[PDB]
């Protein structure tokens, strides 16, 4: 759905802005600095789940640009792995939010953060 | 969830990038230039429905900036109307996509476009 490589870049940086907001806005709740309302978090995590599947389809062949390292494309199986791993971690977050269990949520949340960071360390330009 | 006014602006332009892509990518299908696969459109419209509720929460008080006219805030009831109208039009698109009826989809799609444009004409800076 992208007329030019720039349009895919702009889409994926857009989608990652939204995902980072929907994940990071929960930080105060995971830390106990903000109140935990199960319904409110369940809802926000559903939003995050839909957003978390969107960036990956905007690294199609020929969308080099942005801060994406070229190795996303020369090692596509490994990049595919990292994103499936991250998406599985979002499943576990969903399950914790759907269970309304804050301890489970905080552990899920740390696993999700580690997997964001694992991918950036291999595939996002310093 | 926004530390500064700029963060809300950046979030809402992000969310509208995504919504414009998920709506506009259907244009060739509504026109008959691309094939109509009901399941594929049903899915994309679900994505669009979640995305279409996201921008509105990022025009909270104090997030002036971007190409948002100040009248979004001095006339908040009317702006609220326009967005509820637009979101209702996305419900009708959903219903057409869920029914797998292309004629209904094309009509829904035109109604959705008109309501995007109606709001821009009143509240988006030329
Ligand atoms: C690969 C499997 C990744 C996973 C998992 C996550 N991110 Fe990511 N991120 C990735 C790339 C290749 C890039 C660069 C994209 C480009 O073309 O520039 C990024 C970028 C970001 C950014 C900055 C983007 C911008 O606005 O230009 C942010 C804020 C970001 N990523 C956040 C983020 C979060 C919160 C994640 C888990 C919840 C996450 N990323 C996972 C690759 C990957
Ligand atoms: C108000 C009720 C709106 C509705 C309905 C739609 N849009 Fe919108 N749009 C609105 C505003 C106030 C703004 C400016 C936001 C800012 O702070 O700059 C916009 C902007 C856009 C943009 C350009 C954004 C950018 O990347 O900076 C686009 C591409 C856009 N809007 C598309 C769009 C579509 C496709 C809509 C219906 C599907 C739609 N908008 C509805 C206000 C409103």
PDB file of N, CA, C and O and ligand atoms in Angstrom, chain B residues 9 12-13 16-17 19-20 23 56 59 65-68 72 79 82-83 86 112 115-116 119-120 123-124, ligand 2:
ATOM      1  N   UNK B   9       0.887  16.106  19.922  1.00  0.00           N
ATOM      2  CA  UNK B   9       0.853  16.453  18.501  1.00  0.00           C
ATOM      3  C   UNK B   9       1.470  15.294  17.686  1.00  0.00           C
ATOM      4  O   UNK B   9       0.915  14.953  16.654  1.00  0.00           O
ATOM      5  N   UNK B  12      -0.870  12.306  17.608  1.00  0.00           N
ATOM      6  CA  UNK B  12      -2.037  12.409  16.740  1.00  0.00           C
ATOM      7  C   UNK B  12      -1.662  12.462  15.282  1.00  0.00           C
ATOM      8  O   UNK B  12      -2.417  11.835  14.511  1.00  0.00           O
ATOM      9  N   UNK B  13      -0.535  13.032  14.873  1.00  0.00           N
ATOM     10  CA  UNK B  13      -0.170  13.005  13.453  1.00  0.00           C
ATOM     11  C   UNK B  13       0.246  11.609  13.001  1.00  0.00           C
ATOM     12  O   UNK B  13       0.026  11.168  11.876  1.00  0.00           O
ATOM     13  N   UNK B  16      -3.131   9.630  12.687  1.00  0.00           N
ATOM     14  CA  UNK B  16      -3.763   9.995  11.437  1.00  0.00           C
ATOM     15  C   UNK B  16      -2.925   9.485  10.259  1.00  0.00           C
ATOM     16  O   UNK B  16      -3.587   9.056   9.298  1.00  0.00           O
ATOM     17  N   UNK B  17      -1.592   9.442  10.317  1.00  0.00           N
ATOM     18  CA  UNK B  17      -0.906   8.791   9.200  1.00  0.00           C
ATOM     19  C   UNK B  17      -1.441   7.376   9.002  1.00  0.00           C
ATOM     20  O   UNK B  17      -1.682   6.920   7.841  1.00  0.00           O
ATOM     21  N   UNK B  19      -4.225   5.941  10.044  1.00  0.00           N
ATOM     22  CA  UNK B  19      -5.633   5.866   9.602  1.00  0.00           C
ATOM     23  C   UNK B  19      -5.767   6.207   8.150  1.00  0.00           C
ATOM     24  O   UNK B  19      -6.600   5.587   7.461  1.00  0.00           O
ATOM     25  N   UNK B  20      -5.110   7.255   7.650  1.00  0.00           N
ATOM     26  CA  UNK B  20      -5.141   7.582   6.257  1.00  0.00           C
ATOM     27  C   UNK B  20      -4.591   6.415   5.400  1.00  0.00           C
ATOM     28  O   UNK B  20      -5.103   6.265   4.301  1.00  0.00           O
ATOM     29  N   UNK B  23      -7.337   3.584   5.418  1.00  0.00           N
ATOM     30  CA  UNK B  23      -8.503   3.946   4.623  1.00  0.00           C
ATOM     31  C   UNK B  23      -8.157   4.030   3.143  1.00  0.00           C
ATOM     32  O   UNK B  23      -8.726   3.413   2.259  1.00  0.00           O
ATOM     33  N   UNK B  56      -8.553  11.235  18.714  1.00  0.00           N
ATOM     34  CA  UNK B  56      -9.357  12.188  19.462  1.00  0.00           C
ATOM     35  C   UNK B  56      -8.920  12.484  20.886  1.00  0.00           C
ATOM     36  O   UNK B  56      -9.028  13.617  21.375  1.00  0.00           O
ATOM     37  N   UNK B  59      -6.172  15.338  21.495  1.00  0.00           N
ATOM     38  CA  UNK B  59      -6.451  16.782  21.411  1.00  0.00           C
ATOM     39  C   UNK B  59      -6.967  17.238  22.790  1.00  0.00           C
ATOM     40  O   UNK B  59      -7.858  18.076  22.905  1.00  0.00           O
ATOM     41  N   UNK B  65      -1.171  22.956  18.719  1.00  0.00           N
ATOM     42  CA  UNK B  65       0.073  22.788  17.933  1.00  0.00           C
ATOM     43  C   UNK B  65      -0.310  22.013  16.663  1.00  0.00           C
ATOM     44  O   UNK B  65      -1.466  21.613  16.495  1.00  0.00           O
ATOM     45  N   UNK B  66       0.682  21.812  15.797  1.00  0.00           N
ATOM     46  CA  UNK B  66       0.406  21.112  14.538  1.00  0.00           C
ATOM     47  C   UNK B  66      -0.473  21.993  13.643  1.00  0.00           C
ATOM     48  O   UNK B  66      -0.396  23.227  13.702  1.00  0.00           O
ATOM     49  N   UNK B  67      -1.286  21.313  12.851  1.00  0.00           N
ATOM     50  CA  UNK B  67      -2.239  22.006  11.992  1.00  0.00           C
ATOM     51  C   UNK B  67      -3.651  21.933  12.562  1.00  0.00           C
ATOM     52  O   UNK B  67      -4.627  22.048  11.800  1.00  0.00           O
ATOM     53  N   UNK B  68      -3.744  21.945  13.882  1.00  0.00           N
ATOM     54  CA  UNK B  68      -5.041  21.933  14.552  1.00  0.00           C
ATOM     55  C   UNK B  68      -5.502  23.369  14.789  1.00  0.00           C
ATOM     56  O   UNK B  68      -4.699  24.140  15.326  1.00  0.00           O
ATOM     57  N   UNK B  72     -10.885  23.853  17.704  1.00  0.00           N
ATOM     58  CA  UNK B  72     -11.164  22.495  18.263  1.00  0.00           C
ATOM     59  C   UNK B  72     -11.442  22.570  19.764  1.00  0.00           C
ATOM     60  O   UNK B  72     -12.279  21.880  20.369  1.00  0.00           O
ATOM     61  N   UNK B  79     -16.669  20.022  17.897  1.00  0.00           N
ATOM     62  CA  UNK B  79     -15.582  19.162  17.410  1.00  0.00           C
ATOM     63  C   UNK B  79     -15.904  17.733  17.826  1.00  0.00           C
ATOM     64  O   UNK B  79     -15.826  16.777  17.048  1.00  0.00           O
ATOM     65  N   UNK B  82     -18.376  16.297  15.294  1.00  0.00           N
ATOM     66  CA  UNK B  82     -17.725  15.851  14.069  1.00  0.00           C
ATOM     67  C   UNK B  82     -17.010  14.509  14.218  1.00  0.00           C
ATOM     68  O   UNK B  82     -16.922  13.770  13.234  1.00  0.00           O
ATOM     69  N   UNK B  83     -16.233  14.336  15.304  1.00  0.00           N
ATOM     70  CA  UNK B  83     -15.589  13.034  15.486  1.00  0.00           C
ATOM     71  C   UNK B  83     -16.576  11.917  15.785  1.00  0.00           C
ATOM     72  O   UNK B  83     -16.278  10.878  15.202  1.00  0.00           O
ATOM     73  N   UNK B  86     -17.948  11.000  12.367  1.00  0.00           N
ATOM     74  CA  UNK B  86     -16.945  10.228  11.627  1.00  0.00           C
ATOM     75  C   UNK B  86     -16.873   8.819  12.208  1.00  0.00           C
ATOM     76  O   UNK B  86     -16.906   7.871  11.379  1.00  0.00           O
ATOM     77  N   UNK B 112     -17.495   7.896   4.621  1.00  0.00           N
ATOM     78  CA  UNK B 112     -16.358   8.058   5.512  1.00  0.00           C
ATOM     79  C   UNK B 112     -15.486   9.181   4.958  1.00  0.00           C
ATOM     80  O   UNK B 112     -15.130  10.068   5.761  1.00  0.00           O
ATOM     81  N   UNK B 115     -16.818  12.568   5.550  1.00  0.00           N
ATOM     82  CA  UNK B 115     -16.775  13.046   6.953  1.00  0.00           C
ATOM     83  C   UNK B 115     -15.341  13.377   7.335  1.00  0.00           C
ATOM     84  O   UNK B 115     -15.148  14.307   8.143  1.00  0.00           O
ATOM     85  N   UNK B 116     -14.333  12.717   6.741  1.00  0.00           N
ATOM     86  CA  UNK B 116     -12.966  13.184   7.034  1.00  0.00           C
ATOM     87  C   UNK B 116     -12.851  14.665   6.612  1.00  0.00           C
ATOM     88  O   UNK B 116     -12.395  15.595   7.281  1.00  0.00           O
ATOM     89  N   UNK B 119     -14.687  17.534   8.619  1.00  0.00           N
ATOM     90  CA  UNK B 119     -13.877  17.987   9.740  1.00  0.00           C
ATOM     91  C   UNK B 119     -12.680  18.793   9.311  1.00  0.00           C
ATOM     92  O   UNK B 119     -12.454  19.865   9.899  1.00  0.00           O
ATOM     93  N   UNK B 120     -11.858  18.365   8.339  1.00  0.00           N
ATOM     94  CA  UNK B 120     -10.716  19.143   7.919  1.00  0.00           C
ATOM     95  C   UNK B 120     -11.134  20.575   7.520  1.00  0.00           C
ATOM     96  O   UNK B 120     -10.388  21.511   7.831  1.00  0.00           O
ATOM     97  N   UNK B 123     -11.717  22.361  10.996  1.00  0.00           N
ATOM     98  CA  UNK B 123     -10.783  22.343  12.079  1.00  0.00           C
ATOM     99  C   UNK B 123      -9.317  22.101  11.783  1.00  0.00           C
ATOM    100  O   UNK B 123      -8.550  22.079  12.755  1.00  0.00           O
ATOM    101  N   UNK B 124      -8.940  21.935  10.532  1.00  0.00           N
ATOM    102  CA  UNK B 124      -7.556  21.723  10.155  1.00  0.00           C
ATOM    103  C   UNK B 124      -7.087  22.990   9.407  1.00  0.00           C
ATOM    104  O   UNK B 124      -7.689  23.434   8.453  1.00  0.00           O
TER     105      UNK B 124
HETATM  106  C1  LIG C   2     -12.007  15.803  13.045  1.00  0.00           C
HETATM  107  C2  LIG C   2     -13.214  15.338  13.495  1.00  0.00           C
HETATM  108  C3  LIG C   2     -11.307  15.001  11.940  1.00  0.00           C
HETATM  109  C4  LIG C   2     -11.709  13.916  11.288  1.00  0.00           C
HETATM  110  C5  LIG C   2     -13.073  13.199  11.307  1.00  0.00           C
HETATM  111  C6  LIG C   2     -10.646  13.514  10.392  1.00  0.00           C
HETATM  112  N1  LIG C   2      -9.560  14.341  10.547  1.00  0.00           N
HETATM  113 FE1  LIG C   2      -7.738  14.224   9.694  1.00  0.00          FE
HETATM  114  N2  LIG C   2      -7.130  15.828  10.770  1.00  0.00           N
HETATM  115  C7  LIG C   2      -7.831  16.519  11.720  1.00  0.00           C
HETATM  116  C8  LIG C   2      -6.995  17.522  12.328  1.00  0.00           C
HETATM  117  C9  LIG C   2      -7.460  18.495  13.459  1.00  0.00           C
HETATM  118  C10 LIG C   2      -5.802  17.448  11.761  1.00  0.00           C
HETATM  119  C11 LIG C   2      -4.525  18.263  12.099  1.00  0.00           C
HETATM  120  C12 LIG C   2      -3.782  17.534  13.278  1.00  0.00           C
HETATM  121  C13 LIG C   2      -2.496  18.219  13.734  1.00  0.00           C
HETATM  122  O1  LIG C   2      -2.318  18.429  14.963  1.00  0.00           O
HETATM  123  O2  LIG C   2      -1.726  18.564  12.815  1.00  0.00           O
HETATM  124  C14 LIG C   2      -5.845  16.386  10.766  1.00  0.00           C
HETATM  125  C15 LIG C   2      -4.803  15.972   9.968  1.00  0.00           C
HETATM  126  C16 LIG C   2      -4.845  14.948   9.044  1.00  0.00           C
HETATM  127  C17 LIG C   2      -3.755  14.544   8.176  1.00  0.00           C
HETATM  128  C18 LIG C   2      -2.328  15.153   8.070  1.00  0.00           C
HETATM  129  C19 LIG C   2      -1.456  14.950   9.259  1.00  0.00           C
HETATM  130  C20 LIG C   2      -0.011  14.924   9.561  1.00  0.00           C
HETATM  131  O3  LIG C   2       0.596  13.858   9.252  1.00  0.00           O
HETATM  132  O4  LIG C   2       0.511  15.936  10.117  1.00  0.00           O
HETATM  133  C21 LIG C   2      -4.212  13.535   7.422  1.00  0.00           C
HETATM  134  C22 LIG C   2      -3.458  12.731   6.329  1.00  0.00           C
HETATM  135  C23 LIG C   2      -5.582  13.263   7.785  1.00  0.00           C
HETATM  136  N3  LIG C   2      -5.961  14.142   8.780  1.00  0.00           N
HETATM  137  C24 LIG C   2      -6.353  12.247   7.216  1.00  0.00           C
HETATM  138  C25 LIG C   2      -7.644  11.957   7.653  1.00  0.00           C
HETATM  139  C26 LIG C   2      -8.476  10.871   7.188  1.00  0.00           C
HETATM  140  C27 LIG C   2      -7.999   9.851   6.119  1.00  0.00           C
HETATM  141  C28 LIG C   2      -9.656  10.907   7.789  1.00  0.00           C
HETATM  142  C29 LIG C   2     -10.877   9.957   7.685  1.00  0.00           C
HETATM  143  C30 LIG C   2     -10.560   8.602   7.362  1.00  0.00           C
HETATM  144  C31 LIG C   2      -9.599  12.047   8.716  1.00  0.00           C
HETATM  145  N4  LIG C   2      -8.368  12.653   8.628  1.00  0.00           N
HETATM  146  C32 LIG C   2     -10.676  12.411   9.531  1.00  0.00           C
HETATM  147  C33 LIG C   2      -9.158  16.295  11.995  1.00  0.00           C
HETATM  148  C34 LIG C   2      -9.937  15.275  11.502  1.00  0.00           C
END
